[PDB]
Amino acid sequence: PGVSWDSLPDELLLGIFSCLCLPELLKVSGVCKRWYRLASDESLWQTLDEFRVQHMDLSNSVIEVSTLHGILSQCSKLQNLSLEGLRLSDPIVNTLAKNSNLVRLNLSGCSGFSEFALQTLLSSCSRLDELNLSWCFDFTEKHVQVAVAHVSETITQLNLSGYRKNLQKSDLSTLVRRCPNLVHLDLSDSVMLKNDCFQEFFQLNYLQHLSLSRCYDIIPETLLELGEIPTLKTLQVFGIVPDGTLQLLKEALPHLQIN
Template sequence: SILCLCERLQNLSLEGLVLSDDIVKSIAKNTSLIRLNLCGCSGFSAEALECMLNSCAMLDELNLSWCDFTATHVTAAVNHVTSKVTQLNLSGYRQNLQIADVKTLVERCPFLVHLDLSDSVMLKPECFQYFHQLLFLQHLCLSRCYQISPAELVELGEIPTLKTLQVFGIVTDNSLQLLKETLPDIKINCSHFTSIARPTISSKKNHEIWGIKCRLTLRNPSGL
């Protein structure tokens, strides 16, 4: 009922909630949204998702990780997310995210700086060619993409803009050390958690919500 009254939101996080098509369509009315976090959400159709993404064309950060998505939801996401997005989390889709989806996504979103496709077990080194097309890519997450071997990750070092690479679960301690030596200019496995579209970042202690500084002020109820 609160969202039904909102049409000018710029930042919204509903992480882990059970939503509905009506709620998602209410989100769609907020066409000025810049950051949207729906991580772990469920209860809405692919059609409602498509409607929302078509409407929210100003999104810069979008987290759709670990939602209760079918392959149809994933297809809707990669085909309708705004081309302006620079940070995108589509992790957690196991067999539902295909290499063809990565191709579609990269062609649609050329300005991606931070991309998380972790826990997508259908991805293979074949998809690396698409990452090379992202001229602004700095942060890439492919943790637990088990069809990618440590040796094959070396190719990602050819992406000149890449600064960090998260590949938890697919490299052993020994291979991780070797990978770090082979790719000295890239920080590897330096962050366990995503910050994309989340209000606060656990690694920071600067009391900010979406980059806005906040300070708790205690008031004396007696007025003294």
């Protein structure tokens, strides 16, 4: 005699699992195969509208790429998705393509997927408002180009920082041609960007938060030219401006908020 929990009817297991909160649920899926399948059950995730790594206790643990894919594939109604820092795969990114109505997407620090998967995902999120696709170390120009080529027009806040050598003026050009509604644009650490690209920002008639921190080849003095953006309100330009000139720049554009 040992209590025969390994024989508890699936029905009951679900009932039990329905009492657990999302993060807890992920743990139990590693208990055994019967539980692993049931924890991925449709009835438990089907309705979620927001899934954010942040809120999943996944700090001191590594989610099996496999299982992350099996749970997300059960969601089509997400409006807020953040998988920041997590290591993905193509199957998983292609699957995210279900949630057509994504509003906010955070994949910064993510990696393990293609320029193609990236395309199929952004292409499907045609009502996307804000995207944080920064520091996906894993990728090349193919991706970056895909990024600026397929983010929906609906975009108002975008964050493409961390691509030192894979992002160029042309890419900003493309981005700008296609996304007229941008309000927040972060291109920090875009070391291929020089002041010649500044003209491109003048076509974003609603851009009020631009950030160009650590774009090491921007001749500090040339920044003045950016206060010429009619709607610009704040300018993050860290680590490339020496105090001397930084105080001058501030005095030239007193209406700007520069850090």
